[PDB]
């Protein structure tokens, strides 16, 4: 059930995705409709296992910010 999404930022540099760290995982909390995130089928409750090929379990906010807000982003999803 593991999938990969390969996302492209929109014209304003955004993806339309809200991620939440909750005990033992990073999860999708909100996907804006008609966004790059919604176009690759991300949904509430999806678990993000990898970001740009790195396992992201237990990442701090700083680490996520560095990786995600330092125009292709990849994520491994369960």
């Amino acid at each position: 059930g593991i999938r990969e999404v390969i996302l492209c930022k929109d014209q304003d540099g955004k993806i339309g995705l809200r991620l939440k760290s909750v005990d033992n995982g990073i999860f999708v909390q909100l996907v804006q409709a008609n966004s790059p995130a919604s176009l690759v089928g991300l949904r509430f409750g999806d678990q993000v296992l990898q970001i740009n090929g790195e396992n992201c379990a237990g990442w701090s906010s700083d680490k996520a910010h560095k990786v995600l807000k330092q125009e292709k982003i990849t994520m491994t999803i369960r």
């Binding site: 809200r18 991620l19 939440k20 760290s21 909750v22 906010s61 910010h65 807000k69």
Partner: peptide
């Protein structure tokens, strides 16, 4: 129990 980030 932890952070939120919008991307």
């Amino acid at each position: 129990s932890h952070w939120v980030x919008d991307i």
